[PDB]
Design a protein around this ligand. Structure first.
Ligand code: A1D9X
Length: 113
């Protein structure tokens, strides 16, 4: 394990997220059940090749990271929410997580460095 990893991510918020608003939608109205459907449907399109992960993150991620195509940069442990941190460090570079639940919402993660 390295001291830091670099990941991109796509976040789908829901109405019970920590902050139920984003850059692309002033009030998040969708249920967590609908947030996961989207996450799972993004995963299948990324696996089929129909969709590109960073194109999707730049259009639909409810996180400000979307303006950088999903990239967060490099981070060590002790910084992000534990579920995101653990999931990110359990990835090989170039590997894409399944769903990841944090207080912010539901995440797909892709380790790059
Ligand atoms: C979304 N876009 C950017 C970004 N960031 O600036 O790193 C985050 N972010 C970190 C902050 C705490 C907002 C600085 C996420 C918070 C939830 S997370 O653990 O998935 C990382 N989010």
């Amino acid at each position: 394990e390295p001291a830091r990893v670099r990941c991109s991510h796509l976040l789908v918020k829901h109405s019970q997220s920590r902050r139920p608003s984003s850059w692309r939608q002033e009030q998040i109205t969708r249920t967590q059940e609908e947030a996961l459907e989207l996450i799972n449907g993004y995963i299948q399109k990324i696996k089929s090749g129909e969709e590109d992960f960073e194109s999707l993150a730049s259009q639909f991620s409810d996180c400000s990271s979307a303006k950088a195509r999903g990239d967060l940069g490099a981070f060590s442990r002790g910084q992000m929410q534990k579920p995101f941190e653990d999931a990110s460090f359990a990835l090989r570079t170039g590997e894409m997580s399944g769903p990841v639940f944090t207080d912010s919402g539901i995440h797909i993660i892709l380790r790059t460095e």
